[PDB]
Amino acid sequence: ITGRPEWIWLALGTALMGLGTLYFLVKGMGVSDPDAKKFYAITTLVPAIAFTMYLSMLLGYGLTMVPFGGEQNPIYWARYADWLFTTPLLLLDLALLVDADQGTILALVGADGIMIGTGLVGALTKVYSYRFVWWAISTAAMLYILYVLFFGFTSKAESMRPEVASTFKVLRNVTVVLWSAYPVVWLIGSEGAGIVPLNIETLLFMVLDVSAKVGFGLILLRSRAIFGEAE
Amino acid sequence: ITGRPEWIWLALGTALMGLGTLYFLVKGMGVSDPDAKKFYAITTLVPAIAFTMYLSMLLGYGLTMVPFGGEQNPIYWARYADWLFTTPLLLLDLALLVDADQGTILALVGADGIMIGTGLVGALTKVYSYRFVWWAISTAAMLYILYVLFFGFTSKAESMRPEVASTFKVLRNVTVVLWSAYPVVWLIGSEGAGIVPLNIETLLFMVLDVSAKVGFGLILLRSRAIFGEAE
Amino acid sequence: ITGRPEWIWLALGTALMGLGTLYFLVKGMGVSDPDAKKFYAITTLVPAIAFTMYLSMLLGYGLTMVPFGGEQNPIYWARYADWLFTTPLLLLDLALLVDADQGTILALVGADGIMIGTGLVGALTKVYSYRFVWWAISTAAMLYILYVLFFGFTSKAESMRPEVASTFKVLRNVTVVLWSAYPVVWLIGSEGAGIVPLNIETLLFMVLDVSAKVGFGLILLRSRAIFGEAE
Numbered sequence: 001i002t003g004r005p006e007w008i009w010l011a012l013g014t015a016l017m018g019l020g021t022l023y024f025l026v027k028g029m030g031v032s033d034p035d036a037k038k039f040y041a042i043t044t045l046v047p048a049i050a051f052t053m054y055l056s057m058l059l060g061y062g063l064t065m066v067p068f069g070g071e072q073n074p075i076y077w078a079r080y081a082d083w084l085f086t087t088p089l090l091l092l093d094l095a096l097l098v099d100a101d102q103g104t105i106l107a108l109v110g111a112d113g114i115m116i117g118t119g120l121v122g123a124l125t126k127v128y129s130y131r132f133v134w135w136a137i138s139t140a141a142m143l144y145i146l147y148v149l150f151f152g153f154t155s156k157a158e159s160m161r162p163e164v165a166s167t168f169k170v171l172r173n174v175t176v177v178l179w180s181a182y183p184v185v186w187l188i189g190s191e192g193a194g195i196v197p198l199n200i201e202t203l204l205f206m207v208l209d210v211s212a213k214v215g216f217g218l219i220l221l222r223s224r225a226i227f228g229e230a231e
Numbered sequence: 232i233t234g235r236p237e238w239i240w241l242a243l244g245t246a247l248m249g250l251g252t253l254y255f256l257v258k259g260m261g262v263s264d265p266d267a268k269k270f271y272a273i274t275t276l277v278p279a280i281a282f283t284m285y286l287s288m289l290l291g292y293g294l295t296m297v298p299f300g301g302e303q304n305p306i307y308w309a310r311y312a313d314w315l316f317t318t319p320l321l322l323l324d325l326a327l328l329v330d331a332d333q334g335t336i337l338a339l340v341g342a343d344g345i346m347i348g349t350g351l352v353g354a355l356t357k358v359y360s361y362r363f364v365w366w367a368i369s370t371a372a373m374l375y376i377l378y379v380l381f382f383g384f385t386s387k388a389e390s391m392r393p394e395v396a397s398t399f400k401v402l403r404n405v406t407v408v409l410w411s412a413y414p415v416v417w418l419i420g421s422e423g424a425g426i427v428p429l430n431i432e433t434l435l436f437m438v439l440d441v442s443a444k445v446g447f448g449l450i451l452l453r454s455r456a457i458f459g460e461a462e
Numbered sequence: 463i464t465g466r467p468e469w470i471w472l473a474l475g476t477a478l479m480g481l482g483t484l485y486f487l488v489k490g491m492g493v494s495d496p497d498a499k500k501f502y503a504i505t506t507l508v509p510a511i512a513f514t515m516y517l518s519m520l521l522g523y524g525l526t527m528v529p530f531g532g533e534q535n536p537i538y539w540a541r542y543a544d545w546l547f548t549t550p551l552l553l554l555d556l557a558l559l560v561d562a563d564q565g566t567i568l569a570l571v572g573a574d575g576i577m578i579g580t581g582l583v584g585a586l587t588k589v590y591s592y593r594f595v596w597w598a599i600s601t602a603a604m605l606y607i608l609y610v611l612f613f614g615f616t617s618k619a620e621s622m623r624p625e626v627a628s629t630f631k632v633l634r635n636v637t638v639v640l641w642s643a644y645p646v647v648w649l650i651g652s653e654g655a656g657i658v659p660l661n662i663e664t665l666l667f668m669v670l671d672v673s674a675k676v677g678f679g680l681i682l683l684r685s686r687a688i689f690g691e692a693e
């Protein structure tokens with residue numbers, strides 16, 4: 001395990017996701033409100049899935065070698081397995097907060113699936129120049145998602161409770177900033193142009209992942225917006 | 232890319248799915264009705280997914296070699312990845328049109344999953360005679376789906392709005408004819424008996440795919456059946 | 463096929479799932495009640511999926527070799543493909559019976575996904591001692607599911623119809639006993655410590671699978687709890 005310099009960040013990531021999972025699990029024990037239960041379920045599952053995939057990367061299972069540029073390049077494929085399930089759960093948290101219509105939710109989840117799926121294909125593609133074609137398609141799917149979060153959701157939040165409108169606005173802003181960093185790190189890291197070494201890349205993704213999951217969850221689950229308006 | 236004679240049909244397929252995706256995306260921009268949004272979301276996602284998988288076939292990612300009959304046989308596995316997601320979306324379009332009950336929808340999607348999954352296993356099976364066992368099981372799942380579309384849905388459409396009944400009937404008929412061709416092409420093509428060469432097989436699937444997705448979508452999204460009855 | 467001593471149990475399993483599938487399919491033909499249709503759909507799909515995966519194991523497709531302990535160890539990976547889809551369907555049968563809230567259903571299905579997914583990783587892991595780390599995480603996800611079935615569902619059933627409360631209690635008890643045997647068989651069988659040989663392991667899983675699917679389904683589909691209260 002320690003044979004890879006990036007192991008320290010995989011281990012820290014595993015620990016922080018594990019701790020985040022346990023914290024949300026305990027916190028949600030005292031919850032009976034049916035609406036709050038939905039948000040706790042979604043939000044606890046996110047770091048639990050990430051915990052398993054960080055562990056698989058730490059132990060070496062979630063790593064494969066991909067030939068491109070005349071080299072055997074270490075590619076952590078387990079990231080995409082994580083993201084396939086956790087990024088639509090994160091979007092679902094946002095969509096339920098603002099009572100999004102079903103068509104909009106399906107558009108978001110579908111675009112998200114395309115985003116992660118094409119990122120996976122790009123990560124595993126052996127023809128170097130083609131990796132960036134997949135990156136571009138994935139990034140276009142991301143831009144669609146960000147567009148919807150701003151010009152379909154923000155003006156939906158404003159007709160809702162003030163506490164859900166303010167909580168949505170904060171989580172929207174956190175999401176757009178954090179999620180936009182992922183394609184940049186991929187592009188300059190070992191999957192793309194290879195300018196930033198894998199150990200630093202792994203650190204960067206770990207900070208983004210913990211912030212986008214445990215950070216996000218801490219903000220959401222401390223808000224009164226997750227509860228039905230009750231006396 | 233041009234090293235494979237079937238590349239021209241993969242390229243045309245990619246282009247037509249891409250163009251179809253953009254057309255539906257633009258067309259649905261001016262839509263606020265919650266019901267119509269569902270149909271636009273579902274129907275736009277279908278060629279978008281197909282676009283990505285056609286591209287993966289064009290670039291060579293979605294192709295593998297399978298030993299059977301003492302030969303290395305080129306198998307485009309990306310078709311099944313496409314179909315796994317797009318065929319239940321197509322069925323969902325039909326089921327929502329007639330306000331199908333939840334049990335019926337689950338039966339359809341489940342049978343569809345079995346249909347595509349067993350087709351994939353058959354496509355990748357190395358014992359030649361066993362490929363046709365999987366083809367038979369998949370075809371039985373197809374026949375179940377077609378049965379339900381006729382003797383569970385058609386008489387559901389007739390108690391609904393005339394515009395939804397007439398639109399459903401047309402899309403049902405398009406679906407049954409087009410979908411029934413797929414097992415025949417598989418059986419006589421490079422996956423099955425090998426009587427029709429891969430380049431012609433690829434052409435045939437491209438015509439079926441564009442018709443079943445973009446053709447289907449053009450009929451559906453031009454109907455007033457996708458809108459709630461409103462003043 | 464007969465080259466593997468466990469083939470007889472794979473063949474019997476295939477037959478019993480096939481027969482169970484046909485029986486439930488015929489039985490549900492005379493059903494119009496929308497609630498009952500849901501239970502028939504879910505419950506018929508379960509042995510149908512299991513039939514396909516038992517067949518893939520019989521024909522040899524669903525088997526791979528995994529190096530650990532200095533040996534090539536036969537691992538039937540198709541079990542996890544089965545279980546990935548059938549165990550959440552089984553939980554859905556239980557959850558719908560007691561009209562579980564959406565948050566609880568998502569927690570169950572999510573924990574179940576983690577349970578099966580980590581079992582799959584453990585089954586395919588090449589470092590022997592690490593296989594048991596994945597077994598432990600999977601078992602913890604199982605224990606969560608069993609906890610919810612007892613201390614979240616049982617007291618939900620009691621405020622419902624007596625026929626649904628009594629049917630739920632029986633199916634809950636069947637589920638907890640049968641499902642708890644699976645991690646034990648894995649641990650002592652060819653995936654784990656290797657004390658029980660593969661042919662006996664295969665027998666054990668076949669008895670558990672038929673009981674947990676066809677047995678379970680026979681109890682559920684003969685109950686009046688699956689019908690809406692109607693005059």
Ligand SMILES: CC(C)CCC[C@@H](C)CCC[C@@H](C)CCC[C@@H](C)CCOC[C@@H](CO)OCC[C@H](C)CCC[C@H](C)CCC[C@H](C)CCCC(C)C
Nearest residue numbers: 109110113114117118120121124280283295308311312316
């Ligand atoms: C509604 C939304 C969910 C829409 C989803 C959007 C989605 C369509 C976007 C594209 C997804 C698609 C790229 C998934 C591809 C998975 C694939 C990378 C798995 C690895 O297999 C690739 C090659 C080795 O590189 O296998 C070597 C050759 C092997 C023989 C491969 C044969 C097995 C195939 C992988 C079977 C395909 C199954 C499905 C792709 C399962 C989807 C997995 C998940 C990653 C989407």
Ligand SMILES: CC(C)CCC[C@@H](C)CCC[C@@H](C)CCC[C@@H](C)CCOC[C@@H](CO)OCC[C@H](C)CCC[C@H](C)CCC[C@H](C)CCCC(C)C
Nearest residue numbers: 340341344345348349351352355511514526539542543547
């Ligand atoms: C409700 C509905 C959805 C019901 C669904 C119906 C469904 C049950 C029908 C059968 C689906 C099942 C056949 C999927 C099999 C996928 C498999 C072909 C992927 C390729 O792996 C096959 C061999 C190489 O040929 O791998 C070589 C050996 C490797 C070590 C394989 C180990 C990895 C396994 C593939 C893990 C299994 C994961 C699940 C099958 C994911 C499902 C993928 C999708 C195609 C259904």
Ligand SMILES: CC(C)CCC[C@@H](C)CCC[C@@H](C)CCC[C@@H](C)CCOC[C@@H](CO)OCC[C@H](C)CCC[C@H](C)CCC[C@H](C)CCCC(C)C
Nearest residue numbers: 049052064077080081085571572575576579580582583586
């Ligand atoms: C809401 C709930 C559903 C939550 C779900 C919980 C879930 C997160 C729990 C963990 C699931 C995760 C372990 C699935 C891993 C599948 C993996 C074993 C498939 C086989 O690939 C493993 C190695 C060979 O051993 O591939 C060799 C290297 C290859 C290059 C691998 C590259 C292809 C990757 C497999 C692509 C990943 C796609 C997704 C994992 C699809 C999920 C399949 C299913 C088994 C969950």
Ligand SMILES: *C/C=C(C)/C=C/C=C(C)/C=C/C1=C(C)CCCC1(C)C
Nearest residue numbers: 119135138139142179182183186212
């Ligand atoms: C918890 C993990 C999260 C929130 C991950 C988010 C990841 C993305 C938004 C990834 C986006 C990518 C692209 C837009 C193109 C390049 C490849 C990706 C997959 C890194």
Ligand SMILES: *C/C=C(C)/C=C/C=C(C)/C=C/C1=C(C)CCCC1(C)C
Nearest residue numbers: 350366369370373410413414417443
């Ligand atoms: C957009 C793509 C569509 C509508 C594809 C439909 C495909 C089928 C109905 C495929 C059916 C098959 C069988 C019935 C058995 C042989 C294998 C298949 C998968 C080709």
Ligand SMILES: *C/C=C(C)/C=C/C=C(C)/C=C/C1=C(C)CCCC1(C)C
Nearest residue numbers: 581597600601604641644645648674
């Ligand atoms: C129809 C099949 C059923 C009901 C299978 C149930 C399987 C399980 C509950 C498996 C549990 C496992 C663990 C808890 C850890 C070890 C690995 C598994 C996957 C066997």
Ligand SMILES: CCCCCCCCCCCCCCC
Nearest residue numbers: 181184185188195196197200204
């Ligand atoms: C969105 C953030 C992307 C920028 C990442 C900056 C990383 C700077 C680290 C120094 C680069 C290491 C190069 C020498 C090894």
Ligand SMILES: CCCCCCCCCCCCCCC
Nearest residue numbers: 412415416419426427428431435
């Ligand atoms: C459902 C349509 C299946 C029939 C396809 C007919 C294809 C005819 C093309 C000629 C066959 C090529 C054989 C000589 C290369």
Ligand SMILES: CCCCCCCCCCCCCCC
Nearest residue numbers: 643646647650657658659662666
């Ligand atoms: C939950 C049941 C697990 C116990 C399984 C008992 C199997 C006993 C069979 C005898 C073991 C075979 C060892 C000699 C080959």
Ligand SMILES: CCCCCCCCCCCCCC
Nearest residue numbers: 084085088089092105106113
């Ligand atoms: C490819 C995996 C996509 C599914 C991820 C799980 C999250 C799905 C959330 C469903 C949202 C509800 C839509 C109506």
Ligand SMILES: CCCCCCCCCCCCCC
Nearest residue numbers: 315316319320323336337344
């Ligand atoms: C194996 C992939 C199956 C899922 C495909 C996505 C479409 C699912 C549509 C869900 C229909 C709603 C059922 C209640």
Ligand SMILES: CCCCCCCCCCCCCC
Nearest residue numbers: 546547550551554567568575
């Ligand atoms: C990884 C596969 C998980 C999906 C299995 C299919 C069963 C899903 C049942 C959905 C229950 C409804 C939740 C709201």
Ligand SMILES: CCCCCCCCCCCCC
Nearest residue numbers: 139143146147150180183184
């Ligand atoms: C186009 C929608 C406006 C809100 C999205 C902001 C786009 C940020 C760009 C992210 C950088 C990705 C490379």
Ligand SMILES: CCCCCCCCCCCCC
Nearest residue numbers: 370374377378381411414415
């Ligand atoms: C049995 C249901 C009647 C409607 C379905 C028509 C079946 C068409 C056969 C398709 C050919 C597949 C090989």
Ligand SMILES: CCCCCCCCCCCCC
Nearest residue numbers: 601605608609612642645646
């Ligand atoms: C902790 C919840 C109480 C009900 C679950 C009973 C646990 C049975 C243990 C199963 C054995 C697995 C190794």
Ligand SMILES: CCCCCCCCCCC
Nearest residue numbers: 128129130132133136137
């Ligand atoms: C070796 C790099 C070749 C450049 C490929 C860039 C493709 C980016 C596509 C953006 C439309």
